[PDB]
A paper describes a structure:
The amino acid sequence and molecular structure of hydrophobins are diverse but there are some characteristic features, including eight cysteine residues that form four conserved disulphide bonds that are separated by three loops (L1–L3, also referred to as the C3–C4, C4–C5, and C7–C8 intercysteine loops). Class I hydrophobins assemble into extremely stable amyloid-like structures called rodlets that resist denaturation by detergent, heat, and acid.
After optimizing initial conditions, SC16 crystallized as a cluster of plates over 1–2 weeks. Virtually indistinguishable atomic-resolution structures were determined for two crystals of SC16 that existed in two different space groups: C2221 and P21212. An α-helix was present in L1 from 50Lys-59Leu. Residues near the N-terminus and L2 (C2221: 79Val-85Asn, P21212: 78Ser-85Asn) did not have interpretable electron density, consistent with these regions being flexible. EPPIC detected a large intermolecular interface that was present in both SC16 crystals and had a surface area of 607 Å2 and 589 Å2 for the C2221 and P21212 space groups, respectively. This surface involves both the N- and C-termini of SC16 interacting with L1, L2, and the β-barrel of a second symmetry-related SC16 molecule, with 44Thr, 72Leu, 89Ala, and 110Ile being flagged by EPPIC as participating in close contacts. In particular, the N-terminal tail adopts an extended structure from 27Gly-32Ser with partial β-strand character that associates with the β1 strand over residues 42Asn-46Asp of a symmetry related SC16 molecule. Although the buried surface area (~ 600 Å2) is smaller than the 800 Å2 expected for a definitive biological contact, it is larger than a typical crystal contact, involves a very small protein, and is found in two different space groups. Repeating units of this interface also result in a linear association of SC16 monomers that suggests a possible assembly pattern within rodlets. We found that although the N-terminal tail of SC16 associates with neighbouring molecules in the crystalline state, it is dynamic in solution and does not significantly influence the self-assembly rate or morphology of SC16 rodlets.
Author numbering: 11 to 62, 71 to 99
Amino acid sequence: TPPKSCSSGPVYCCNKTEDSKHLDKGTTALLGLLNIKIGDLKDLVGLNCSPLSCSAQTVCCTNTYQHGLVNVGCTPINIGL
């Protein structure tokens, strides 16, 4: 068996995360641009995310858009000791 963490998807390293209930206007605007419905989102929104070393936020996300411009359905994950 290989090591496993996220139930769905790779671990992501996201430069920034925000609570999907308290997104700033630029983040909100960017998600509308991408046609993402805010009211159907849960947990965190990640910005500028790369699948996995991470000096920013390591998160599990259900979806990633535009090469990691925006992730959604993100929750923190600890893959250390």
